[PDB]
Scaffold this active site. Structure first.
Site, PDB file in Angstrom:
ATOM      1  N   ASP A 150      41.605  32.608  48.334  1.00  0.00           N
ATOM      2  CA  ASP A 150      40.387  32.531  47.533  1.00  0.00           C
ATOM      3  C   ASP A 150      39.913  31.086  47.316  1.00  0.00           C
ATOM      4  OD1 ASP A 150      38.160  33.735  46.214  1.00  0.00           O
ATOM      5  OD2 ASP A 150      39.225  33.853  44.270  1.00  0.00           O
ATOM      6  N   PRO A 153      34.566  26.563  45.382  1.00  0.00           N
ATOM      7  CA  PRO A 153      34.466  25.427  44.441  1.00  0.00           C
ATOM      8  C   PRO A 153      35.013  25.711  43.030  1.00  0.00           C
ATOM      9  CG  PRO A 153      32.474  25.591  45.790  1.00  0.00           C
ATOM     10  CD  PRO A 153      33.248  26.858  46.007  1.00  0.00           C
ATOM     11  N   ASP A 177      45.969  44.927  42.762  1.00  0.00           N
ATOM     12  CA  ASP A 177      45.884  46.398  42.810  1.00  0.00           C
ATOM     13  C   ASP A 177      45.331  46.996  41.511  1.00  0.00           C
ATOM     14  OD1 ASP A 177      47.154  45.961  45.297  1.00  0.00           O
ATOM     15  OD2 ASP A 177      48.833  47.339  44.908  1.00  0.00           O
TER      16      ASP A 177
HETATM   17 NA    NA Z   1      40.212  35.251  42.767  1.00  0.00          NA
END
Ligand code: NA
Ligand SMILES: N#Cc1cccc2[nH]nc(N)c12
Length: 310
Positions: A150, A153, A177
């Site tokens: 992930d 910025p 999950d």
């Molecule tokens: Na994230």
């Protein structure tokens, strides 16, 4: 991943401070202010017993004692991450419907907040940001065999000591999950197509984040002739944006404004084909990285001036 003396010392000071904290408990925290929001809010807090200022991320989730105890066990992996390029971790606990992740407070906030203030980030400053992101991703892959997943910025944090660190790399399968909602706008074409994805997908996200910070705008779809004249003198729904990423040529920096080494660097991050895309090893020795490393750039100085820190 060899550290200099100053880095080795800050890492040791952090651990020595952390070892005094002990078990993190809900009633030991005093909320100072909000630092940002996502599927969770981040507060600047005071850990009253230790007197330490921390960043507390609260994830509100209604789950049985079975699930929360497994999530907390999985987040303990974060105590093993010790790097100048990874946000410090104090601990994780559950309290009255929410998981708390307690981290090192970074007084410069995230680069999405810095970009909002700055308008655009200078190429020499993005050179130091690139070095920290590459080193952060190299550390995660080499010492813990994990990928960030992930990069964006808002997941790059900065401080007044000139440090640049990554945060929010998924370490708990159960926490994801039980959730299952962040943007997919920085995801690589291969992840959006469900196909083969490695650390190469994080390099794409870095490339995209760098273009956004350099031009001062999310770079998809590309800016027109008049939009560029507005910028340097010299709407799209989320589902349309994701289709654009998979089907159209990648974004690029405007020419004539940035160095060719910087333009070449981002082009090698943004090659649609993950096999052709540069890898961490190749990025570490790219001309833009070697040049940025030799540059003595006052990041802390630039940062404090730009965001009015102080
Ligand atoms: Na994230
Ligand atoms: N914004 C923000 C944020 C998110 C996660 C950890 C953090 N430490 N220091 C921050 N400012 C921060």
């Amino acid at each position: 991943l060899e550290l200099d003396e100053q880095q080795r010392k800050r890492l040791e000071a952090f651990l020595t401070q952390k070892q005094k904290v002990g078990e993190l408990k809900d009633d030991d925290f005093e909320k100072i202010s909000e630092l940002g929001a996502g599927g969770g809010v981040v507060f600047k807090v005071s850990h009253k017993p230790s007197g330490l200022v921390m960043a507390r991320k609260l994830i509100h989730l209604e789950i049985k004692p079975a699930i929360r105890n497994q999530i907390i066990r999985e987040l303990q992996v974060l105590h093993e991450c010790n790097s100048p390029y990874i946000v410090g971790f104090y601990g994780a606990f559950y309290s009255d419907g929410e998981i708390s992740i307690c981290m090192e407070h970074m007084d410069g906030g995230s680069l999405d907040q810095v970009l909002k203030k700055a308008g655009r980030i200078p190429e020499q400053i993005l050179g130091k940001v690139s070095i920290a992101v590459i080193k952060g991703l190299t550390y995660l892959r080499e010492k813990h065999k994990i990928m960030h997943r992930d990069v964006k910025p808002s997941n790059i944090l900065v401080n007044s000591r000139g440090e640049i660190k990554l945060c929010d790399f998924g370490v708990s399968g159960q926490l994801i999950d039980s959730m299952a909602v962040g943007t997919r706008s920085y995801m690589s074409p291969e992840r959006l197509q469900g196909t083969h994805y490695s650390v190469q997908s994080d390099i794409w996200s870095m490339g995209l984040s760098l273009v956004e910070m350099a031009v001062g705008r999310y770079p998809i779809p590309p800016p027109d002739a008049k939009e560029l004249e507005l910028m340097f003198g010299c709407p799209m729904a989320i589902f349309e944006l994701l289709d654009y990423i998979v089907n159209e040529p990648p974004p690029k920096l405007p020419s004539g404004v940035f160095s060719l080494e910087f333009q070449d660097f981002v082009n090698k991050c943004l090659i649609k084909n993950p096999a052709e895309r540069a890898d961490l090893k190749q990025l570490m020795v790219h001309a833009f990285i070697k040049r940025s490393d030799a540059e003595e750039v006052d990041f802390a100085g630039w940062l404090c001036s730009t965001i009015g820190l102080n």
